[PDB]
Amino acid sequence: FYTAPSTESKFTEVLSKAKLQYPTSTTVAFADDLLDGYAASYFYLTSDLYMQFQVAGSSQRSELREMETSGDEAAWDCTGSTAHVASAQIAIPVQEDGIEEVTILQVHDSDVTPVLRISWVSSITIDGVTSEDVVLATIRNGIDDSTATKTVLQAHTTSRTEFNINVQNSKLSITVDGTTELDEADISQFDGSTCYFKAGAFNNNPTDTSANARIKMYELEWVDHHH
Ligand SMILES: O=C(O)[C@H]1O[C@@H](O[C@H]2[C@H](O)[C@H](O)[C@H](O[C@H]3[C@H](O)[C@H](O)[C@H](O[C@H]4[C@H](O)[C@H](O)[C@H](O[C@H]5[C@H](O)[C@H](O)[C@H](O[C@H]6[C@H](O)[C@H](O)[C@H](O)O[C@@H]6C(=O)O)O[C@@H]5C(=O)O)O[C@@H]4C(=O)O)O[C@@H]3C(=O)O)O[C@@H]2C(=O)O)[C@@H](O)[C@@H](O)[C@@H]1O
What we know:
GO terms for molecular function: lyase activity. By secondary structure, this protein is mainly beta.
């Protein structure tokens, strides 16, 4: 009884350039399935026209994964001269109790390392400063270094918020509601990797493994701009 995101033309292009992974890294719906009206409790269109992702369980996900229209997986040079841009209008509801962090957008390499995660966190402590109920950028310091550089981007609001990730040469920038919140962070540690975008709900370290993480996107796209 769920309405498909594909019924809104604002999502046709990104769905054509995506596959849906749920509840783990297995594909449940390819582009052609998504465009044919794929809909489920973990992926549906709300009555006010948000694409809503919902999932429970530790490290479980409902997430779109960037694809080419050819059906090739996206695998662009992480540090190449072509700009890669992901834009989304995201409403982050107040999360259920037991939900501690939800990744909503990613730049991921083609193996096992996330270049960037944008995530809601109940709390984070950075260089001695604790922030609560914020949106966070996490950039991994390298494939062989589990540590990351963390940057608070925004105080959590339920209001629809514009996020832009711009990746070009060895630099990554994030804008939030038109304001640069991460200005040309270095990602040269991913020279020689290939990369793709992800977007949705990716549930990190819940304290209640049955609670549902939930994330709503009013717009979503990922594009290239050739230099
Ligand atoms: O700063 C502090 O406060 C403390 O930080 C601590 O370290 C942190 C660290 O800073 C950072 O926060 C880190 O975050 C974790 C994160 O919680 C989460 O676990 C994340 O998960 C990753 C995985 O590591 C893995 O990369 C996985 O890869 C996926 C892909 O996403 C993709 O789905 C892929 O699909 C392909 C498969 O081939 C499929 O079969 C399919 O068919 O094809 C696809 C395809 O390519 O299309 O499959 C991959 C898979 O294997 O599942 O993706 C997730 C992800 O999506 O991001 O990992 C990060 C991380 O950076 O490791 O957590 C640390 C921590 O908690 O310890 C400490 O440093 C502390 O001292 C600080 O104080």
